[PDB]
Amino acid sequence: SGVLLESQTKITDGALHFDGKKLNHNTFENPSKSQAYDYFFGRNISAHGDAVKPYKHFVFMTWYKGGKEERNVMLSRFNTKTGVVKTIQFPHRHTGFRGDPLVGESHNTIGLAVSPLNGTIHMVYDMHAYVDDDETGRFKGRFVDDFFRYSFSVAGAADVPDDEFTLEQFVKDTSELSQGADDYKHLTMTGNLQDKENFSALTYPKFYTSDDGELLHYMRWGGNNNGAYYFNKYDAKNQKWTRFTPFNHKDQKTHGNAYNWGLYGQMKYINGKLRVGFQQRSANNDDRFKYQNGVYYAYSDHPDGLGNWKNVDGEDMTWPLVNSDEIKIFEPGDYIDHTAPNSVHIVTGFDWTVTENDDVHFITHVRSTDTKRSDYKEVSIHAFKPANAVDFTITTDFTGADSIYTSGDSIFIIGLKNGYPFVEKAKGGSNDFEVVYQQASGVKFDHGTIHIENGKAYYYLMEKGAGNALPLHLQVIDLGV
Ligand SMILES: [Ca+2]
Ligand SMILES: [Ca+2]
């Protein structure tokens, strides 16, 4: 298969991880003050999200400093030629669920990008739909002037010698809203506070690099059954970003739709175009879908995504989008025979990709909402349209996965099995997966996050262990393509 482990490097002994108990609506205001670190959603916050990016012979990695009492934003640069790892500790510390640092908040990843055009570094972090509000608000005024958190460096910072890779490469907030001399968090990416409302209430920072070396970024507004993707672009010449522009309208019921809907999926820049693939969550609570339904896909012929959107058949899409029917590919709910209200459960197991040969691939998963019914049904689905085919092949002869990747002529499933990375590989446009790599010895891992580039998988991993300060490792896996 050609798949092999090319390197494994320890990046730190102590990154943040939530080792306490899971809280809920009833218990989150009384978190543990002892050594263990309670959390509200999941345990993962380091080596999680868009936190690993190669750049020339470097790999940059973000993480939160471990120890429940530490939690600083960290940036590490790994020189793959010399083996040196140099780390910058930022003043901002994870602020936790709704701003209480005693409750870990796994949405609040540290997204990362490096511009190949001027060597600037960009980080957006510790965000979950925050806004300006006051003591009576959901956030109790804890994010005033600080609801969007962006740090960035001067030009060329990515390439400085190790001795010079320091917090001094990054630009302080010196605006009228600066919180002090250690404030490295900018409220907008445009450099203009007049835009701050355009940066309000966002979650999930994710960066891409265009084929021309331009950085793209998108985030999600809202969530649940009323959400939207917003994207913007980096102007390297002026060292600032554009305002966010929507893929779809929020509040769709006020823009001409029968219902509001949310989006569960990803925008991705693939094959030289901004594209999107998702399952919707309609606000309709009377149809058969308790949560998500459908598979949806579109791509833009505009270099920055500003219009000229099309569905998989090349038909023009209303933009910003209002009615998801325009770009629907198929209905995974059709693969289970329940029809009563809320009887069909679709949440986990969705992802999509497009290969360099233009094969289109979706994976998803569907089960009965009622796990106790005697006619319980559960299926994983692989839908793919080979490069030259007219229609999608849709099959349940598939074991399911949380992600799908592509490089060269192949698609990949990459994850952990019993704590060890594995790789499954298939030809693009096919369902012929085979396990081609499986680590079998060494320290085991709790979780990780993957970036594909250069025909390699950069697998940024947290080692298994007790406590809330655990080691991080970078594995570089050659995918044999
Ligand atoms: Ca600030
Ligand atoms: Ca529904």
UniProtKB/Swiss-Prot annotation:
Q: Endoplasmic reticulum: is it a keyword of this entry?
A: no
Chain sites annotated for binding Ca(2+) 2: 284, 287, 289
Q: How does it sit in the membrane?
A: Lipid-anchor
Site (Neutralizes the sugar carboxylate group at subsite +1): give the residues.
220
- Effect on the protein upon substituting residue 107 to A: Abolishes catalytic activity
Q: Which residues bind substrate?
A: 106-107, 264, 281, 345
| Reported effect, residue 204 to F | Greatly reduces catalytic activity
Q: What class of enzyme is it?
A: lyase
- Respond yes or no to whether keyword RNA-binding is given for this record: no
Q: Where in the cell is it found?
A: Secreted; Cell membrane
Please convey what the UniProt record notes about how activity depends on pH.
Answer: Optimum pH is 8.
Q: What keywords sit in the KW lines?
A: Calcium, Cell membrane, Lipoprotein, Lyase, Membrane, Metal-binding, Palmitate, Secreted, Signal
Q: What is the effect of changing residue 128 to A?
A: Abolishes catalytic activity
Q: How does activity depend on temperature?
A: Optimum temperature is 40 degrees Celsius.
Q: Which residues form the active site?
A: 107
Enzyme nomenclature, EC number: 4.2.2.-
Q: Which GO terms describe its cellular component?
A: extracellular region; plasma membrane
The Swiss-Prot or TrEMBL record annotates one GO molecular function as:
lyase activity
Ligand binding (Ca(2+) 1): 173, 183, 185
Source domain of life is Bacteria
Give a short account of what the protein does.
Answer: Ulvan lyase involved in ulvan degradation. Ulvan is the main polysaccharide component of the Ulvales (green seaweed) cell wall. It is composed of disaccharide building blocks comprising 3-sulfated rhamnose (Rha3S) linked to D-glucuronic acid (GlcA), L-iduronic acid (IduA), or D-xylose (Xyl). Ulvan lyase catalyzes preferentially the endolytic cleavage of the glycosidic bond between Rha3S and the uronic acid GlcA, but not IduA, producing oligosaccharides that have unsaturated 4-deoxy-L-threo-hex-4-enopyranosiduronic acid (deltaUA) at the non-reducing end.
What family is this? Answer: Belongs to the polysaccharide lyase 24 family.
Protein name according to UniProt: Ulvan lyase, short isoform
